[PDB]
């Protein structure tokens, strides 16, 4: 019931499709998929306060947020955005993103801790739903 820990990915669906919707060019798409196939995920949870570090060779994101309070981060393709995380349920948080500048597909992400010990990351861009599953390492 604690998101804290080091996570390793075991499954990933539609990540490429997601990037395609976001306008990422064909080659970057392949580079991204490759890099994102073996990310290092570190999460530290203190009550409603979170620290999530996702590292890959070509891109590392570090976000700090408190459930319920807006913060700034970036969409998966690097566009700055305003995010707000809320609890959809006891083990699931949902984040709605708003581009700071310009227009683009509506994006969001959700992270859910399953009762049997796994972490499901869901990322969406318009109608595309990307599902990534992690287990503790």
CA dist list (Å): 38 to 56, 59, 65, 99: 7, 12, 24, 27
- For the CA atoms of 16, 40, 131, 120, the dihedral, rounded to the nearest 10 degrees, stands at -170
Is residue 51 a known part of a binding site? Answer: no
Tokens 């408190």 belong to residue: 66
DSSP-derived secondary structure for 19-48 = HHHTT--HHHHHHHHHHTTS-EEEEEEETT
Residues marked as binding for all-trans-retinoate?
Answer: 132-134
Residues marked as binding?
Answer: 132-134
């Amino acid at each position: 019931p604690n998101f804290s820990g080091n996570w390793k990915i075991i499954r990933s669906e539609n990540f490429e499709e997601l990037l395609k919707v976001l306008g990422v060019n064909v080659m970057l798409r392949k580079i991204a998929v490759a890099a994102a196939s073996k990310p290092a995920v570190e999460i530290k949870q203190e009550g409603d306060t979170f620290y999530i570090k996702t590292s890959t060779t070509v891109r590392t994101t570090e976000i700090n947020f408190k459930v319920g309070e807006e913060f700034e981060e970036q969409t998966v393709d690097g566009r700055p955005c305003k995010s707000l995380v809320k609890w959809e349920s006891e083990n699931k948080m949902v984040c709605e993103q708003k581009l700071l500048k310009g227009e683009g597909p509506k994006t969001s992400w959700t992270r859910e801790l399953t009762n049997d010990g796994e972490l499901i990351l869901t990322m969406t861009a318009d109608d595309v739903v990307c599902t990534r599953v992690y287990v503790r390492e």
